[PDB]
């Protein structure tokens, strides 16, 4: 099945359905993101780690990489924290700049896998502007598209570098 | 028509093939094209409506976000579109909620959602915004809807509507 959420204004909707998704799973959590330097998201991670059995993989776009780095560093994120964490970074493909640099393509793609059991995907960034100011769109996936979503994560995780945490999933 | 058919849902990941839809979607609406965009400095994609638009008799309404009125503009100018080109289109400005930036200024939150309603018989969404860096080096997901789910996205799409406000071209439905 497939199900679309859109962003009330009262309230942010799609934020809580993030937090309840990650906060709800079990066993397995793997993710792939742009942007992560909302605190809070990532301690909902810490918490279904650490407090819970989770096994967390985190496949970021490169160009994120830096200022998730700043994120831990500010809290002071370390090994110990990551027994069951994962962060890999991950990049789309290269190309020339106009200043003859080669850059990589921006991984745009963001969801989220729970449990190998549903799936949710949209414009919602690990940030704290899309998580209080912008309005985003939010889609649930279950049933034969998450394996679609499986080979996606497979696909781009075979390509990725390690970051931190766990480097043995 | 939409709402004969029975909900259906499809995803797509990157291969461009993703653009392809993209356009393919715009090249092959017949009657109504509606679209939410962030993002449009895109100038292959505005000549794809414009075909429609005015090749066809399609009807096209794009609600662009207003963070992206200046550039869309720009892009306008660049090839010298006019009023007479827009005969069957209508470019309208909408914006999120208002909250305060660190600077005390007002701002508007950005309308990060994005979907193409074509014919009101399916739906495209996803990452794809309509810039040259998403058409050549950005991996976008994209994600197709038809039937019963597409009424939600249509009454999103109102809902948004409603709020918006005319920037260019034909001034109605």
Redesign the interface.
């Known amino acids: 099945?497939?199900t679309?959420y859109?962003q009330t204004?009262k309230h942010n909707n799609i934020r809580d359905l993030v937090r309840r998704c990650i906060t709800r799973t079990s066993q397995v959590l793997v993710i792939l993101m742009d942007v992560f330097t909302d605190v809070e998201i990532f301690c909902d991670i810490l918490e279904a780690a650490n407090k819970r059995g989770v096994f967390v993989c985190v496949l970021l776009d490169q160009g994120g990489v830096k200022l998730f780095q700043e994120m831990c560093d500010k809290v002071q994120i370390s090994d110990s924290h990551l027994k069951n964490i994962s962060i890999r970074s991950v990049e789309?493909?290269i190309?020339c700049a106009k200043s003859g640099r080669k850059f990589a393509?921006?991984?745009?793609?963001?969801?989220i896998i729970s449990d190998w059991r549903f799936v949710l995907?949209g414009?919602?960034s690990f940030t704290w502007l899309?998580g209080?100011?912008?309005?985003?769109?939010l889609?649930k996936?279950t049933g034969q598209?998450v394996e679609?979503?499986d080979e996606?994560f497979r696909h781009l995780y075979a390509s990725s570098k390690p970051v931190m945490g766990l480097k043995s999933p």
Do not use: D, M, P, T
């Open positions: 099945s497939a679309v859109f204004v789309g493909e190309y393509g921006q991984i745009r793609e963001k969801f995907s414009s919602y899309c209080h100011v912008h309005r985003n769109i889609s996936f598209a679609l979503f996606e």
